[PDB]
Design a protein around this ligand. Structure first.
Ligand SMILES: CCCCCCCCCCCCCCCCCC(=O)OC[C@H](COP(=O)(O)OCCN)OC(=O)CCCCCCCCCCCCCCCCC
Ligand SMILES: CCCCCCCCCCCCCCCCCC(=O)OC[C@H](COP(=O)(O)OCCN)OC(=O)CCCCCCCCCCCCCCCCC
Ligand SMILES: CCCCCCCCCCCCCCCCCC(=O)OC[C@H](COP(=O)(O)OCCN)OC(=O)CCCCCCCCCCCCCCCCC
Ligand SMILES: CCCCCCCCCCCCCCCCCC(=O)OC[C@H](COP(=O)(O)OCCN)OC(=O)CCCCCCCCCCCCCCCCC
Ligand SMILES: CCCCCCCCCCCC(=O)OC[C@H](COP(=O)(O)OCC[N+](C)(C)C)OC(=O)CCCCCCCCCCC
Ligand SMILES: CCCCCCCCCCCC(=O)OC[C@H](COP(=O)(O)OCC[N+](C)(C)C)OC(=O)CCCCCCCCCCC
Lengths: 132, 53, 69, 90, 80, 77
């Protein structure tokens, strides 16, 4: 149902500091009165050693499903969009070009595209119109 | 003010300015769609080229 | 309405529905102030701006390319 | 007034002369800043040519762009320590 | 009333008219009046109707020429 | 002064601990694993990237000496 965030130790040992089960304060019932209503905290409540990871200011913890299920659903989705892409590519179902792609005179506008001399024609030329 | 129990909600008494403005903008859109469609239904749908008058 | 605690919290933006008693007097001064140097923006802009496509003739640029060649 | 570069090379001085080594160090610094000035002038020509030529900039500004791309690697401050402390011919 | 492609513009006339590079093709001759008409008429859809239709038809003929070329290219590719 | 902050004992205990984590740190296998990653593994990875490409990237005014677009088209049928 409701599970703790990751990287939360199940035990710790810090001398005489009180040892308590980590409570993610984001999940507290918001219809109860608190001394700190915004933070859902009463005065003098002991803090976990990593309470900054288990309070309102920590990143929100989404727990509708487990992370693996969400990661499995996430991969399942984009896997379909890759199978759809791969079926068409290998089978070659995309249409062919209806016309020869555009070509241009003047050796494919080589001079207009920053070509210096005949040695650098195909370096800068667009597709060449062989039909004068 | 007083609340009337059980009485159903009839068609609202919307101010005439709100209704007429709404029907002018909607009628303006529909007119434009029909006006553009009449002169461009062949050009839009690939049934005739723009220069083939 | 509510309690805005306006006794000591007076931010530059006003603090919970603040309109001073002499707001009409100040509004005219600010409108005069806004209008006065809004023309100053126009006067500066017309003097300083220029057309970067008309600063050099095309004949001047042909010499540049050949000389730098 | 406008001071001038005391053209003095590391190759023609004794480094034990404190004032002569100071001049060669200054002389090399001032010649590199002038090349930076020249590069900026060439880039000014490129920008004006590009704006005016419009779609003709590839052809009209070809040699200006070629010269700027050649001068850019070495028309920058290199310091005097590199050439002071190194003899290229050895 | 454009039946076939017009005569090609010279290189200098393309530079004089500042024709876009992608549109320096067989139909650049018909583009010069249209861009001249477009600027005068604020590019409004109703102003330069005839000059726009003529240039659109020219690109249609240039396109159909490229349709014919690809059929020609495939024939050489099929028979080689 | 007038003690304008309502001191919280649990806040003070928590804050005092966060300042004094060094007292309870043990150089166990878990600590050794993180020390190796942060101070040996990662610096080595950047160490080998820095000297591999030391002077091997002349990228100032780098020119194009090869065409980008294909001249001829070949259908797939
Ligand atoms: C490089 C990799 C990313 C580096 C990550 C650095 C660690 C995170 C640093 C931010 C610490 C979190 C923080 O500052 O406060 C939490 C904040 C709240 O966000 P949240 O609770 O989700 O918003 C709900 C609003 N009702 O959470 C945040 O809004 C933090 C916003 C993200 C910080 C930058 C992360 C960019 C990640 C880009 C890659 C994403 C995948 C592609
Ligand atoms: C707190 C304020 C701190 C006070 C210290 C800061 C001092 C600012 C520096 C003073 C400079 C004096 C000055 O304005 O010189 C006038 C200058 C003329 O120089 P000129 O060579 O002729 O212009 C070349 C522009 N191509 O003319 C100019 O070029 C200035 C024009 C620049 C316009 C930039 C606008 C920036 C935003 C302006 C917002 C404020 C102006 C509006 C005033 C209130 C309007 C209601
Ligand atoms: C507007 C200036 C007058 C345009 C010339 C008169 C005209 O016929 O155009 C009216 C125009 C709708 O006509 P339209 O189909 O766009 O093209 C011209 C059709 N002979 O009307 C409009 O374009 C109205 C556009 C919204 C205002
Ligand atoms: C450079 C010299 C490298 C010396 C490495 C010292 C390693 C070290 O001190 O590890 C800590 C260890 C105490 O153990 P601890 O940290 O509490 O965690 C162990 C839990 N089983 O410490 C010990 O195990 C006690 C032995 C300490 C020896 C220190 C030698 C100092 C002499 C050289 C100084 C330089
Ligand atoms: C490009 C540079 C722009 C410079 C000028 C921009 C306008 C300056 C506004 C100053 C007045 C103001 O916003 O600060 C004063 C207002 C006060 O709140 P109030 O609305 O009066 O309500 C009052 C009721 N309280 C008291 C509950 C708020 O905000 C605050 O203290 C809110 C805290 C955030 C500080 C915002 C600082 C913004 C600085 C921008 C950083 C680049
Ligand atoms: C916050 C903590 C940071 C600490 C400092 C970080 C900088 C580390 C620099 C690593 C350099 C490195 O990896 O250099 C690699 C070198 C030699 O490489 P090679 O493969 O033997 O020879 C290279 C020739 N090749 C490429 C042809 C195979 O290794 C050493 O002899 C490093 C000695 C000191 C570290 C042990």
């Amino acid at each position: 149902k409701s599970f703790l965030p990751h990287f939360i130790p199940k035990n710790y040992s810090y001398g005489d500091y009180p040892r308590l089960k980590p409570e993610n304060l984001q999940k507290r019932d918001p219809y109860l009165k608190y001394d700190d209503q915004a933070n859902k905290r009463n005065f003098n409540e002991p803090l976990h050693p990593q309470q900054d990871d288990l309070d309102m200011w920590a990143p929100d913890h989404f727990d509708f499903v487990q992370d693996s299920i969400a990661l499995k659903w996430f991969g399942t989705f984009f896997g379909v969009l890759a199978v759809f892409s791969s079926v068409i590519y290998i089978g070659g179902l995309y249409p062919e070009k209806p016309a020869n792609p555009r070509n241009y005179p003047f050796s494919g506008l080589a001079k207009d595209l920053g070509a210096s001399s005949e040695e650098d024609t195909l370096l800068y030329a667009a597709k060449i119109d062989k039909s004068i | 003010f007083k609340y009337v129990r059980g009485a159903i909600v009839p068609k609202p008494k919307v101010h005439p300015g709100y209704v007429i403005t709404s029907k002018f903008l909607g009628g303006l859109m529909w007119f434009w769609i029909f006006y553009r469609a009449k002169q461009d239904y062949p050009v839009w749908f690939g049934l005739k080229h723009p220069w083939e008058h | 309405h509510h309690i805005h605690t306006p006794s000591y919290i007076k931010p530059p933006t006003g603090g919970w529905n603040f309109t001073p008693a002499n707001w009409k007097q100040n509004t005219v001064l600010v409108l005069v102030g806004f209008t006065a140097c809004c023309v100053g923006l126009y006067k500066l802009g017309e003097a300083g701006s220029y057309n970067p496509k008309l600063k050099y003739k095309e004949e001047e640029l042909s010499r540049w390319n050949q000389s730098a060649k | 007034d406008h001071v001038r570069s005391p053209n003095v090379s590391f190759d023609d001085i004794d480094y034990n002369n404190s004032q002569d080594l100071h001049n060669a160090q200054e002389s090399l610094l001032r010649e590199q800043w002038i090349r930076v000035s020249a590069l900026k002038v060439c880039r000014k020509a490129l920008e004006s040519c590009y704006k005016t030529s419009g779609p003709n900039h590839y052809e009209d500004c070809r040699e200006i762009a070629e010269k700027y791309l050649n001068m850019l690697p070495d028309h920058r401050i290199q310091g005097f320590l590199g050439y002071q402390k190194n003899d290229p011919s050895k | 009333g454009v039946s076939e492609l017009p005569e090609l513009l010279s290189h200098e006339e393309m530079k004089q008219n500042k024709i876009p590079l992608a549109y320096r093709d067989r139909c650049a001759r018909l583009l010069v009046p249209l861009n001249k008409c477009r600027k005068e008429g604020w590019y409004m859809p109703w102003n330069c109707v005839q000059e726009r239709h003529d240039y659109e038809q020219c690109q249609y003929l240039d396109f159909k020429r490229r349709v014919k070329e690809l059929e020609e290219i495939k024939k050489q590719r099929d028979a080689a | 002064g007038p003690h304008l902050l309502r001191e919280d004992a649990s806040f003070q205990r928590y804050g005092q601990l966060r300042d004094n984590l060094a007292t309870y740190w043990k150089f166990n296998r878990k600590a050794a694993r993180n020390v190796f990653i942060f101070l040996v593994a990662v610096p080595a990875g950047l160490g080998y990237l820095a000297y591999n490409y030391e002077g091997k990237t002349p990228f100032v005014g780098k020119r194009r000496t090869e065409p980008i677009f294909e001249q001829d088209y070949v259908p797939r049928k």
